Every structure is written in C-alpha cells, then in structure tokens.
Amino acid sequence: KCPPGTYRNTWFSGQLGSPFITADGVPVATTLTELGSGCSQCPPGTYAPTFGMSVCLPCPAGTFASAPGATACQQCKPGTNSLMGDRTQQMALVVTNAANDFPALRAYTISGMVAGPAYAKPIVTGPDTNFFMAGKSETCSTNLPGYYTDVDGLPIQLPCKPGTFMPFDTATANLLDTGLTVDGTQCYTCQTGTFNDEFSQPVCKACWSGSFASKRGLPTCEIAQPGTFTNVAAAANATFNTATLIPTGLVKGAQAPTPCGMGYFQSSAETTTCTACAVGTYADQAGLAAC
Amino acid sequence: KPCQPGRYQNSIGQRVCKPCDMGTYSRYGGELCTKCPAGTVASKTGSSQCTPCAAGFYANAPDSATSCRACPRGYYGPYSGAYADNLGDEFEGPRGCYKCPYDFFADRPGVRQCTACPPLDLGGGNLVEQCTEDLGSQRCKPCSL
Amino acid sequence: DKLGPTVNPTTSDAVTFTATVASPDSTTAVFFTLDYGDGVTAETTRTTTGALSTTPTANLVSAGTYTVTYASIGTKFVTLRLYDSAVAPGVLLASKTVPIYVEDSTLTATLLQSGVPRLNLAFSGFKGRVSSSTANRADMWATIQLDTAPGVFESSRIFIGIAPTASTNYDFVIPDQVYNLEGAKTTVLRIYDAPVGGTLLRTFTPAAANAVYVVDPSKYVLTLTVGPTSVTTADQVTFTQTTTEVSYSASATSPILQWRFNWDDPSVVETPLAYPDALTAASNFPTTATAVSSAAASTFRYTSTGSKNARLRLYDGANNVIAEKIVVITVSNAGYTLA
Amino acid sequence: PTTPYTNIPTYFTFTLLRDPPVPPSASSGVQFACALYTGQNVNPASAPSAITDAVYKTFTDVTTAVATDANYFADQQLRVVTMAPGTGRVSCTFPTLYAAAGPFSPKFFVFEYASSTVGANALAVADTVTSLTSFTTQAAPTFITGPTNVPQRVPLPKGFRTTCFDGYELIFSNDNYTNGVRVAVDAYPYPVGQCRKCPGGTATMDGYRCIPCPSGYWSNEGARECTACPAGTIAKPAALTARAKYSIDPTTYHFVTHLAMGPESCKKCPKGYFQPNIAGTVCLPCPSGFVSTSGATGCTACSEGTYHTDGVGTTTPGEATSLDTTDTFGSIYPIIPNTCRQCPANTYLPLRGQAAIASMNLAAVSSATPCRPCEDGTWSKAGAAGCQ
C-alpha cells in the first residue's frame, strides 16, 4: 500500500496547485512523488490520512491544506475562514487576466445606500459562481465585513446579530472608540444615537429626526413621545463606495429627546419641532403634551 | 448560557466552548468531557453521547473507545457493548470476542455465534463426524484423523 | 466511420461508410476488406488500395457497391481489415471496428419545451413524448443531453414506463436542467430500452428553427417612461408607449417575448400579453432598442394613496418572468388649502 | 528536518546500527548508553568540561524519569537502551525544551553498557562525539489538526444554514438555492449559507464537502454514498474540462479532473482479461494457459490437445477487438491472445492449460509451443491427448 500522504490511481496522477496564489489564476501542474515508492503526493487542498488510497479526500469546510500531500489538514484560526480565494479577491470586481476574469470573484455583496442618493439591493448583482469552502488550497482568508469566527475551524463565517456590526478594519471603521480594535472575532455594539436592524452589517444606521437611541446596540430606534422632539440635521447614513464596497459617512443621531420649551407644546409623537399654542392657552412647564 | 452537548469549558470568564475530543462526550454545560463508559464508542469530536458496540464487534479500548472493530475469524462476540482490555489477548475481554469452542468454528469476522462442525458425507447413510484441532479455528477436519 | 445518413440509420436506411489508410514507414499497396455486422452478407472481395503515404488515402469505400441495409435494430459492428495478398492464407496486417447504431422506426419520440430557459437558474419546461406505431412496448428509459460541446455529459436515465395503447401519445416529465452558458444549444433526447445498457431505440434533436436558446436575463435593457412622479389622486399619470423600449444586448437571435404593464391599482387590470412594436411570433428579440407599441399614450388616475410600483414585465411562452422594470409613483393628497 | 521549535517539548530520537546483529540465540541483548548534551545551559547552569568520555560518562541516568520530576528536561542526560536478540537496530529518545532562540550545538555519545557500568566509547575509536547540525529555534505554530466544528447556537437570518444533509454541501452565496438547485438570483441582501447538491461522481455524509468516489465506485448527483461496479467491469471516470472563465458555474474543486458518473462508467474488461472482485480497479490478464469471454469474472483452461495462443486464422478468433480495448480504455489494456489451438499431427499434449512460450527477441530465440512429439512407434492424429 501507498504511504498515508500519497495516492496512486490508474487514470490520473500528479497534482494541480492553487490558482489563487498565482498571477493569471491558472493551476500549475506538478508531479511530486514519494521517494521510497512511486505514489504521487496529494494536491494542495486535499489530504490522505490512511495507507491505501486511490483518491485524495478534499478537506472539509473550515479546514485547509496548502502544501502537497499531507496526512491531515488544520483548522482555520479565529478571524479567518476557508472560503475559496483571498479576501482582496473575494471582494474584487476588476479583472486583470482578460481570458480568465481571474482576480474578480464576486463572492461578496451587500445592500445599502449609494452615491445616486439611491438605495441598492445587492450592490454586486449577478449569479454567484465562487461559493466553495471545502477545498482550501492556501492560507485561510480574513473574514468579509459583517462576519466573524470566534473558534477554530468554523465551516462558514457567521453574521453579526442585528444590534452589532463589524467594520472592514480599524482605520476604515465608522463610529468606533479609541481603544477598540477589530480583528474579525468580535462584533461591536452600535453607539448611542445609532441603531442596526439587519444581519451582517459593516456599519450601524443613524437614527432619523424624530427618534433617538438612548441605549447601546439597539435593534430599533426609539420614537419621541408627545411633549418632546429630536431634530439632528447632520445625521446621515453611510454611503457605500461602489468600487471598494466600503461605507464612509456616518453621523449619529440623538441620544435623548428635547422637551418642548416653556410656552410651547407638542402633541404628535414622531416630530422635529414644537408649536406655540394659540390665544387663550398657556404652557408654563417644559415638555407638555398639550398646553 | 451553558455549553451545549459535545462542548466543554474549564475556564471562567470565557466566551466560547471548546469541543470534546474523540472517545469523550458531554451533555449540557459541563466543565470537562466525560470519558465514554467501558464497551461503548465515540469517534467524532462533537459527540453528545457514546454508542455501544454492536453484537459481533468490540471497542478498541477499555475506557475511551474510538472505533468498533470486528472480531477476528476464529472468534465470536455474542454480547453488545463488548470491549477489549489489553491484559489478555488483543482480541479478548470480559465481554469481548471469545475463541470459538473446541469443536465449533467460524470463518466470517463479525459473527454472533460459532457454528458446529458438519459431518462429512462420503456416500449413502454414512457420515464421518468432524472435530477441530485447536481452540479458535475456522475450519473442521474429519475427527478420526 | 459511417457517413451514410448523418443521423443514426433505421432498418429502412442504407449506410455508406468512409475508410482511409496511411502508413508512416511503408509504401507498398495492400488489399482491404470491409465486413458488416449484418450476419448474412460475407466479407467484401479483396481489393487493392493506392500507394500508402503519411497522408491518408482517399475514401476507398466511396463506390456504390459498398452499401448495406440492416433488418434488426441495435448495435452493428462494422470491421475493416488489411491483408497483403488476395489469396485466403494471406497474412492479416491490421483491423478496425466501429459501431453503427440502428434505431427503431415504429417508435416516434419528441421533446417539447414550454418557455425560454434562462441562465444558471433552473429550467422545468421540458417534457418528452413517445408514440409507438405498434402495440404494447416494454419498459423504456430516457436521457437528455444539454449540448454537444466537450465536457457536457448525457444525463441519467429516467423511467418512462410502457406505451400499450398503440399510437397514443405518452408524456413524461424531465427533471430541472441548468445551463452554464447563454446562446444557442443542441439539446438531444435519447430513448433506450434498458436501465444500464441495452439498445438505443431513438434519438430526437429539435430542428434548426426550434433549437434551444439559453437567454441571459441581465442583458435585457428595459426603458420604462411613465409620466409624472409623485402626484395627487386628481393628477393624471401618463404612460407613453412610443418612448418605452425593450432590447436584448447580447445577440440578435434570441427568442421573442411578450410584454405586460401593470399600474399597481386594483381598479384596472394589467394589459394583455402583446408583442413589441412590429414583431410577431416568428421574429426574434431586437438588439437595437425598439418602442413597445405604436399606440397612443395611456392615461390613468389613481384611486388610492401611498406608493405604487408601475411595472413593465417581459413574459415568455410558459408565463415566466424574464425581465422587469419598476417606476415608483407616490400619490398623496397632502397639500390642499381650502378657504 | 534539523531545527526544533521554541518553548515546545522536543524529542530527539537517535538510531544505532550494529553490523553483525545480536544472534537470536543470545542469552540477552546488548546494552548501550546514550549521553546527550543539548547545548543549552538552563538546568545544569554550566556547560560541561572539555569534550571527552571522562565527563560525558558522568551525566545522570534519567531512563525511568516522568514528566513531573525536575530532571525530565535536564540538559545533560544519559539513557540506557538494550538490543534484543534478533534485532540490531536500536534507538534512544531524549526529551528537551529549548527556552531561547540562540544557536545551539548539541553533542552525542554512545558507550557500551556493562552490568550497571558505562564502558568505553561504542565507536571503538578514541573520544568521538557526534556533532549535530547547529540550529536556531523558530516560533511554534498554533494551528489545530482536526475536523470542522459545528457552530453552537447563534441568531441567524431566515434561510442561513450551518449544516447540510447527506448528498449536499455548504456554499456561501446570496442567490436562492432550493433542493440544491439554483432557482433565483439575489434572493438575499447579503451572502448566506446554502446547501447545494453534490455533483454526479461524488458523495458525502457530513455535508461540508463533496468527496469524489474511490476507484471502483460510481454515483449519481445527490448520492450520499457511492455504489460498486459489479464483478467483470471496472469503473472508468469521465474526463472533466475545467471552466473557461471565473464567471462560470463550476462543477467541483479545481484539483478534481476525473469523475465517475452514473452506471455508464462501468466498462467491461476485454477478452483475455478478467476481474472477480465486486469493487474492481484493474483488469487482470488471464493466467498463462487460460481463456475468457467479455464479461470474464473468471477464466477457463485450454483442454487437452490444445495450447493457448492467438487464433488469428482460426474459425472463431477469440481476441478482443479495437473497439473493446483502444476505444474504451485507451492504451492501458492492449489486445492479448486468448484462443486455444489444436496440436499438429504426430504431436500430443496431455495436460490442461498450456501456452506457446513467447520470445521477445525473435532473432536469437523463436517462440515455442509445448506440443510433445509422439514416441517412436506411435502416430496420433491431430490435437490429441495421447499417441496410438
């Protein structure tokens, strides 16, 4: 029998390397054999644990083997996963090998506001065609924005829960305090004045005028009550750079509602102003639902 | 929350639960993984319970079994949950595979009982009884010679 | 190899072959013999070839006497041998065997499709039809091959059943098929009489006019020009049919589709299925943008308030939705002052 | 092959070979003592004296040390090993632990071991050390070898999958994937985990990969385990063509180039070959003097008066055709002779299963048939088992 790192088959032999570590994205075929025998070593991305094997088993989702024939493949460390390709390639849209469309694996997409002040259901559309987690023939790729892996060898990236978010990295992160760093293992809460209600987001959303977010990591914005109002005119949502898929401009909303001043009152809930009430009525307290 | 079955956490203040190794299992939140009982097996690394080796098979350990192996050809295992303590033979335990009895035989590896040696037919109305030479054997010869 | 009939022959078809020889070291002429799997005819009388070069000789079997008609369906092994002398004990030098599949004539098989199959999305409009000219048939199995390009493989075998009641049409459904590339394809339907081996009873390929065309739904350009944006329920909204455009930006041979327009109001029905400006069921979808119709503009006044999705859709034969363009109109009677 | 890691218990195994092995009839094996100085200066706190036998014999005996006592990772160790009768290769293992990354020069010594006393240098020349290659310890990697971890319970969007069924695999996409077949594009705002059918030729039971079938097996698309080609036929996988561009749906991973599709991948062995096993991989040529049909789960022997050779000019040639060998398997299985031919006149053959013995260099030696001639006074007719 062949040793437990090699295989011998009648119909094929040799191995094909990973195309995601080359320039033109073409697997490079080599023929490495174990010295004491003739059996060929397993290709990168596969492994052979036992002795007599005709084919090399591909590694499962969450593991990787980046060298020729190996007895077993290791688990991807936290902060990295086993999606096919690299992160700068999973996110890219510009090809360099025209005959191959190589360095564009449109495997990352997201919905959001874009520069035609327009909402966009998935910014990267089309039929996904690079969706592979089993055969990982290189080092594990860093997580895409909005996803995290906290333990070794998770099969798939998990998405951040609605109240939290995960930026691209620390430098390009939106509202995120001084000491906090992002490495792909921790989803951070949304600051006060910001909310988030969707899964796997790279940025929080700004609370609109007439609403506030007093707590941290709110899945929904609180609505101002009669006798109060919030009017933050600089609050805005992040706009997604359609070329790099990274959102930039976020300004948080209000943390607490402003009570109506003396002589003014407000009766509707979601509003941005106070109305002075007419003749015959007065308001001698701040925050009156009806004078 | 407590660690789910198949996971454990021996430290305080952590945010993840580590997975149990082969031969061990764990129920809901537990500090450590408990070794499989004697005679039962667990091969994966997220096992929530240990399954017992079936009749005709034996566990390849006295405490933490990782694979149920078939009995050899000269042996038979009648009991479910048979294990192999390493003190005696390799394929022999208190409930593990036993040698076939002195005048019985078995040839298939995983068998739940040995079969008696058949008489040898030479012609009409004459049968030569057949015996076995050793204790654990897989073929019978005429008992006269 | 056979040239004969381009499609597989039947028991009522005569097969004509083509065979050439070439040697890279020798040049002396040899004598060739051709034998059919008929079982009744004998080996052809030994006849010489020309001088042998590296270039293969012309068709040695091109004469009119090298023909055969098979009386039974199945696989017939046609063999060709090379000797040196024309006498019986002459030494054999080479031999070549080729299979010829003769199909049944009493069984007619057709493959009918409902709508246009899009790209990688699944397609479930295919179904097959079998009609036997004779009485009860035994069990049958059918396979479908999506294209003849290399790397495209014949599917598994689907149990049809039996066809007992003479020349009645028996229909069977074909599992969902996925096409990897857009453009024209040559899908073939084959029918055998065994689950694993057996005889090739029939093959069917749609004619050049009915060939399958896989369409790419992201290449459909739709230009919808509904009238004014956010309005009131008293404001008339217009849909100009001479400015709205539909086109296919990949090729000029795509199948035609119908269009429909929805006002997103329950008071009015959506328009019936209609063709583009002047095309009919025998035309193709135009690559250059064309007006949807030459009629006058259509006006409508909404009966409620809110946000409405006035939409234009492209349907196919099976009433699938291939492409769709939505223009949003916000109706609201907000600012109205009465003194 | 030469350098260890840092702050990781590293085990040095030394293998000793003795030219005349200890006789199996020896009353006892031959004992040796291996002394190692790791080159570090942690535990003994001082490098030893000059490199001689007189100082290396002093190293403490740590043969039966455990991991608990302080001398387990001691830097100057002596371990006693024994060569059992019949053997002649032995090995001694030293545990070490290198706390820094500086260069190190370990030294090794072998001595003959008398009754609890270290003898002379085992290389029989004067004080010879075995200087290992100097090295610099690197940093220990922290990767874990094992299978995938099924994630614990987390909030997920409706449709996100973390486990697939049998015959399916987990993929990362934002399209719609029902029953393993894509039915719509962009059904989710963000990519989620979907279950996609395994391709024909592969099978799975965990749902995290599509494992191609081993040789001798085949399967259809959604199979959860491969099936074996029956006896007499071998499974030839069909050749795949890799996708032209990276904007095209792939079939499997980039390293998979042949797949064994449905039952059409079982091809019969040719004439003259046979294959008895129920999951067969190669066609075995018939044994010398035996013949077989196309199916050929077994062979039959040429009868008396007949010898096994090629029947090119006979009435019923039994050799395989070009279609059965070259158009089906390629150049792997060529055409071989499997006919039984009659003995000539005045020659007899009394045994079954005999073959014309071949000659590959036809100029010097010619091929010979094993047809015995009849003795004087006996004639025999043709293809006979005995003379008259």
Ligand SMILES: *[C@@H]1O[C@H](CO)[C@@H](O[C@@H]2O[C@H](CO)[C@@H](O[C@@H]3O[C@H](CO[C@@H]4O[C@H](CO[C@H]5O[C@H](CO)[C@@H](O)[C@H](O)[C@@H]5O)[C@@H](O)[C@H](O)[C@@H]4O)[C@@H](O)[C@H](O[C@@H]4O[C@H](CO)[C@@H](O)[C@H](O)[C@@H]4O)[C@@H]3O)[C@H](O)[C@H]2NC(C)=O)[C@H](O)[C@H]1NC(C)=O
């Ligand atoms: C960044 O991007 C964010 C993307 O989500 C975006 O969040 C969205 O913001 C919009 C507002 O711009 C949220 O709209 C929702 O509209 C509902 C109705 O709004 C008004 O309703 C009135 C109904 O009439 C009643 O009330 C009026 C007085 O208010 C009274 O006069 C009548 O008599 C009636 O009694 C109507 O007249 C007005 O015309 C408006 O249409 C609100 O009720 C919503 O409140 C929400 O309720 C949701 C229930 O699930 C809850 O999920 C929300 O958290 C919230 O409590 C809300 O105002 C939209 O919901 C929101 N998206 C989500 C999913 O939260 C941000 O606005 C954007 N940020 C910035 C700064 O641009």
Ligand SMILES: *[C@@H]1O[C@H](CO)[C@@H](O)[C@H](O)[C@H]1NC(C)=O
């Ligand atoms: C996916 O497709 C099925 C059937 O076409 C449909 O019922 C289901 O709602 C779709 N899922 C999503 C997320 O749109």
